[model samples]
Target: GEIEFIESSKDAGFPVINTPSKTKLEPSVFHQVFEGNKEPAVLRSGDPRLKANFEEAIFSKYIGNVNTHVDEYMLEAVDHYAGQLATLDISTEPMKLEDAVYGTEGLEALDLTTSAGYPYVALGIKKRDILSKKTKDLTKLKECMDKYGLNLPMVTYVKDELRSIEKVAKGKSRLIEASSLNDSVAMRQTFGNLYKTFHLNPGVVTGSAVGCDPDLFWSKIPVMLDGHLIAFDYSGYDASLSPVWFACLKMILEKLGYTHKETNYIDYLCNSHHLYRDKHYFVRGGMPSGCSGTSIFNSMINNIIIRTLMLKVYKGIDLDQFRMIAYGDDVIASYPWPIDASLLAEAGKGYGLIMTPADKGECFNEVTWTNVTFLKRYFRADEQYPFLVHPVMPMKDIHESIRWTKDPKNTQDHVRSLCLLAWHNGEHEYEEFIRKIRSVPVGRCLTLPAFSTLRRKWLDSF
Candidate 1:
C-alpha cells in the first residue's frame, strides 16, 4: 500500500497522518506532537539536546536575566521555526510498501526500528518493514547508479572542488591525511603516548573523559564546530542524497586507495534515506536516526562539505596547515592561527549546515580545551605531551553531594545536585542518585519535596 496524504497544516505545512491502518507494525516507544493550545511539554518526551540548546542559547542569553513566562516567546519561536521550514525546498513523494521494506534480511538482529518517530505506526506499518524499506531504497539507489556510469554527473561536475583537498595538501602530506582522521585507534596512534596523554578511568565500564596539560599543542588552538541538524534536518538528507555525496564518497575512497567493497558498503548505506510522515503524505528529510551508519555517513558528507568550504575560503593557506578530525557531526580542527567562529558559521550556512550556537562552539586553547572532552579523550599532537589524562571526579565529591538532611533547605540543595549531576551521569547513575536524594524527608518544612518544582527553581536561577 502507498502512503496517503490526507491534508496539510495551513500554519506549518506538515503532512497530517490521520488515517489508522490495519497492519500491526512495531510500536513507537513515544512520540512528541506539538500543540499550542495544550499545556507546555505535556506529551513531550524530553530531548536532552533541545534542553541543552535552550539553556545555552536562549535561557543563558535572555531568559536568565529577564523575568518572563515561557509562553511569552515560545509561540514566536514556533512561528520562526515554521517559517524556516516553509522556506526550505522540501517536497513529498509516493513510496510503496514493498519499496520501504527492501533491507529486511537482518532486521531482527537490530531489535529496533527507526527510533525517530514516524506516522507509519498509525498505518500499522511495522518497524522491521519500515527499516527494510529504507534498505531497499538504498539498494535500488545503488543499482540505479550502477546502471548509469559509476560516477554521478553532479559529483563529476564538481570533481575538482571535491578533490581540492589534495591540491591543498602540498607541504604537509601526512598531516593532511591526519586532519581527516576518524577512527579512535588511528587518532591515538598518530598522536602517541597513550597512557600519559590519554587516560580513561579504570572503574568506568563504558564512555570516556580526560584532562590534558596545556603545554601540548599550545602553539595553535583547535577550533571545533559542532554541526547541528545534519542528521535531523530533512533538508540535510536532500542535500546529502543528491547523489553528489555518493559520488564524492566513491571518488575519495578511490583516491585514498580504500577497497571497492568498503565503498560499495558505504554507497548502500547512504544512497537513499528518508522518514515517513502522514497527513498530507509529506516525508521528513533527514537520514534515519537509529540506523548504524547514519552518524558515520553524516560525518562523511559533512567532512567533504567542510573541506570544500575551507579550500574556497582560505585560498593561499594550504589545507595541511589546518587539522580536521570529524567523528559523526562534531569536528575538531586545529589551525596554525586563530580562526573566526562567525566566518566558519557563515561558510557553513552557505552549504545549508548549521553550526552549534556560538556559545557552545568555542575555539579552545590547551587551557580552555582541557575540561571539554570529545571522542572520549582530550587530544593534542605535541610531541612531548600529545594527550592529557585525568581521572574521574573522586568518590569523595559524590559522597559530599549525596549527604543531605530532613530539612527543606537541605533537601532543596540535594535536589540541586540532581539537576547538576543529571548533566554528567548516565541513566543508572541518575536513577541511583534520585533514589538517594529522595531518601531524605522534608520533616517540618512547609513546602512538599517536589522534584519538578525544585529542579525548576534551580534551572531558573541558572
Candidate 2:
C-alpha cells in the first residue's frame, strides 16, 4: 500500500478506540478487522525504551486524545512495577503480573502457543502429540517480511524444519540475526528504525487509541455477536500455541491490508535479533511483551475470534442469551453459570487454543476486577451499566499515590503530600495547603516506602 492506503485508513477510523461509548454507538473496528489474517507475532506490546518519545511517528497515521493514545513512557512509568511505585505501610512485591492473575499455569515457561488457550487442564500435562508444539512451515516467511520496510532480497534463515523456543537452550542470549542476510549493517538499522516506528509504543498509539481501551473493548462488540453468541471462556489460556497465533493474526491483517505499505507498528516481529547474543533468535512462542505489536494484535485478534466463534456457536445452537465480554485472555460471561464449554473448548483446538470451564466473576458487579481495587469516579459501575467504559487507576495505584506521607527528609519535592494524594484520587482536598504553598513548592517525601527504588519520574511528572 502507498500513502493513499494509509490516508484512506483514516476514514476507516483509527484502529485504536477513542471514546468509551464507541462500542455503544458503532460497530467495533477490532471485530471487523479481526477478519483479516495479519501476522499474530506482529503486535505492539511495550518497549523497554521509553515508548512515549515515539509518539508522532508511531501514531502519525491515526489521531486521538492523550487518553486513548496511551503514552508508552507514561504507561511505562506507572504500569511496570507500579506496585513498587508506592505503599502506605510500605511493603514489597514483584510487578509485571499486576493486571494479570498468575495461576500455577506454565504458558511463560513453554514455547508460547498461537492463541490464548492451551489444551491440557494444566501445562506439561502432555508430552508431544499435538500438545506442546512450535513454529512450523506454517505461513510464508517472506510474506510476513514483505510488510516490513526491510529490503532483504535473499531469505537464507529459513529453517527447513520448525523450531521451539521453550525447548531451545536458554544458556546464551540469542537472536535470529537478519544483518547476516543479504542486508548490510545499515540496512539492519533501517529495518530496526521502521520496526520501532510501527512496533514500539512510546506514544502508546494503540494503548490510548479508542477501540483498544479495556472499558471500550469489553462492551458492545457485535452488539449483535453478543446477542447470539455462546462465547467460550478459558482456563489455562495463557499457554496456548504461538504459531497458530502468529498465523491467524497475520492472516487477519493481510486480509484487511492493514499492514500494506502502512508504517504501522508490527512491520517486523519475531524478526528482531535484539542483538542479544551472536546469531541465535527466539525460535518459538508469541512475540515478546517489549514489542508494542505483541499486545495490540493479540488482544484484538482474540476478541475477534472469540466473538466469531461465539456468533457461530449461537447460530448452530438455539441458545440466545450468550454474551461474551473479553478482556485479554479471560472472557466474562453475561449468561448464567452453565455454558457450552465442551463444544467451544473442542473447536478452538485446531487454532492451538483450548477452552475449559473457568469462572472468575467474583466482583462482576462493582468498580473492580479480580483483586485490583479502584477509585469509584472512574471505574465504578452504574445502576444501568455494570461494566466500565474505561478502567481507571486500580486500588493498587490509589495506594501507590499514598507515597506522600513517606517523603524523604533531605529531598525537596513539589506538590504537598495531601495535594499529591488528592491528585491521585482526582480531587483537591489539600486546597488550604495549596494556597499556603502557592508561592513556594511542596516537599519530596522520600522515606522508607516499599517503592523508594521506583524507576522513572512518575512522581515528578505527577
User: Model 2, which residues run further than 4 Å from truth?
Assistant: 1-241, 258-279, 311-350, 354-379, 382-397, 400-462
Candidate 1 regions off by >4 Å? Answer: 1-109, 112-247, 253-277, 280-286, 356-367, 370-462
Models, CA RMSD each: 19.9, 23.2
Candidate 1 global CA lDDT score: 0.31
lDDT of 1 by residue, 1-462 (tens): 111122334334434433221111221111111111111111111322122232122111111111123231223322332232233222222123232223122111222332212322334544444334334333533333244333110000000111112222211101000010111112122112221111222111101112222222222223222221111111223222333444554554444334565456444333322222221222112222333334444554445655555554664544434444444554455455555445555655544445543224344223234443343334334233333222223223444333322233455555454345342333355455555444444322323334455434433431
lDDT of each: 0.31, 0.29
Tens digit of per-residue lDDT, candidate 2, span 1-462: 011112222343322211111011121112221122211111121323223322222222222111112223223222221222122121112112211111112112212222111112112222222222243321332332343334321111111111122211211111112221112222222223222232222111221121233334323332323322233344334334344444444444434333433322233442222222112122233333333233444454454445444444454432234333333454444443334545555656544465654433432222123323211223323223444222334333332232222223422232223233333222232333233333223222222212222211222322
User: How high a TM-score does candidate 2 get?
Assistant: 0.34
Clashes of 2: 59
